[PDB]
Design a protein around this ligand. Structure first.
Ligand SMILES: [Mg+2]
Ligand SMILES: [Mg+2]
Ligand SMILES: [Mg+2]
Ligand SMILES: [Mg+2]
Ligand SMILES: [Mg+2]
Ligand SMILES: [Mg+2]
Lengths: 311, 311
């Protein structure tokens, strides 16, 4: 069972998906035969599916080409998380640090030594295509979001063995960086062809909406992933219900009820923020509100995927 | 003894120091009583001295105010390295990861939870003053350089216990990030009031000079710091002579001879690169060549300081 959040009042189904979902899924499989990032063909098929079909919901406006770019970056990042991070790879946190440091060198520019992992070179190519498409500031924001995620995955890898050693407030601030929401949005500004001034980014209305969408994305993933993340060998995962259970005692069921209330409140904040920003102003504050709405709908959609709940 | 590199033909003494060296040293001590980053008053005095007097050589053009900003950032970063990183702090690599993750949150923007270390809040204030002074792209480059350094300090902390487990080529690519040269230069573009186009940064002449200055800064620090870094309890440090000694066998003296040859060659490359770029073009390629020359002279200067060789 486990109580789950109900978004009917804030983000009702269905979530619009754009056209190019099945082509993207095929062009992603051709790309991956050219750059094998996943060991298993089974794992590859599930991840290619949720990425392509999820990307259709994240950016319904699209362009079959722009969509494939974003889908390739998101699959690259998720595959890296799944192969190396969260303790999935051997060698402990130290091996992830070595892999993350190679990627930092790609991000810093100026040809680093060749790596025997394929992830650095793919990232190099992906960043090249995004740099050509984005403004200078927009690329920098994409690159920053990725640098921050790498530090946060290193952080997570040092705490998965003892999730109870993490304070709830630290987890809530770190989780937006491990759920990739900042990279998704920075990629969205590029591909949807808009960009906010640094003064607009400082607006409370803009920050409060971005915070609520980041919280909601991480928390719903935590709830949707808890059973799968649990069925592995290790104990409780480093995630929201585990920390609420440690904080309040009681049962996991009551932790999920608490988390589900947290998520519904956060969805209400996000809905109200989308309405404020969409009620016109600069066209950049709209479009951004609409970009964040579709990103949010796609995160709610992907919790029903096989990657999380099987059948 | 230990053979050391001779830069007389490439970067002869003396190195010009600007005027405001002693005021900066006093204004730094007043700042630190307001924000204690160093435990000891002895440690504080040495570090304030080399930072203020070194900063006078790094940016002779100056402005007593602009100089104090840069000096505060460089002292903040060096104090963080000295207190938490390279194994100086207890709790192993994991404690440094937690401290670095707090700083990543400062860099990402949007108020993280309050930390009980003072380093995050000082960084928050320092970044605020640099954002007001720099262009949007220039601030982003400063912030990126700092993100990259944090990952590289985390990397170093995972390898100091077994320096021989590091390949020479990996160390050479990582060391520019732990010697802080990229932050120094990005701060210089801001404070000297210039900035390169992304196409200029791609010029071979610009990249080859930046690489040679980064190599030289890290390597001369390695050689100057080897005796001090050795006199601690642990064995050989994670640094150039240690890795050359492991690569070639032989003696530490022959490793230092090899490293000294590497440094003199690199200084010759840097000198030739400074001449090419200074021979006019856009005024931005000059000034940059001159900025890098002064940065390089300051790194050579600071190897004679008490922080490295005592008396
Ligand atoms: Mg993860
Ligand atoms: Mg996962
Ligand atoms: Mg999950
Ligand atoms: Mg160091
Ligand atoms: Mg040191
Ligand atoms: Mg040193």
């Amino acid at each position: 069972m486990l109580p789950l959040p109900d978004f009917t009042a804030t983000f009702p189904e269905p979530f619009p998906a754009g056209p190019h979902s099945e082509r993207t899924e095929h062009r992603l499989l051709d790309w991956l035969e050219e750059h094998p990032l996943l060991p298993s063909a089974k794992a590859k098929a599930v991840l290619v599916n949720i990425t392509s079909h999820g990307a259709s919901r994240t950016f319904p406006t699209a362009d079959a080409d722009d969509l494939l770019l974003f889908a390739e970056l998101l699959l690259w990042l998720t595959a890296f998380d799944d192969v190396h991070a969260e303790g999935n790879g051997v060698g402990g946190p130290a091996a992830l640090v070595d892999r993350a440091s190679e990627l930092m060198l790609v991000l810093a520019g100026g040809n680093p030594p060749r790596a025997m992992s394929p992830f650095p070179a793919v990232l190099h190519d992906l960043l090249a295509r995004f740099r050509a498409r984005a403004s200078a500031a927009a690329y920098h924001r994409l690159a920053a979001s990725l640098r921050d995620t790498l530090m946060a995955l290193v952080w997570e890898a040092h705490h998965v063995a003892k999730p109870e050693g993490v304070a709830l407030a630290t987890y809530l601030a770190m989780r937006p960086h491990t759920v990739f929401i900042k990279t998704i949005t920075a990629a969205g500004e590029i591909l949807l062809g808009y960009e906010l001034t640094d003064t607009q980014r400082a607006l409370a209305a803009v920050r409060n909406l971005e915070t609520a969408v980041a919280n909601l994305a991480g928390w719903i993933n935590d709830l949707a992933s808890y059973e799968r993340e649990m069925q592995r060998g290790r104990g409780q995962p480093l995630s929201l219900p585990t920390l609420l259970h440690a904080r309040h005692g009681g049962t996991i069921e009551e932790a999920f009820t608490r988390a589900s209330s947290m998520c519904e409140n956060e969805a209400a904040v996000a809905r109200r923020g989308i309405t404020h920003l969409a009620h016109a102003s600069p066209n950049a504050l709209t479009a951004h509100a609409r970009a964040l709405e579709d990103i949010t709908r796609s995160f709610i959609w992907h919790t029903s995927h096989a990657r999380y709940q099987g059948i």
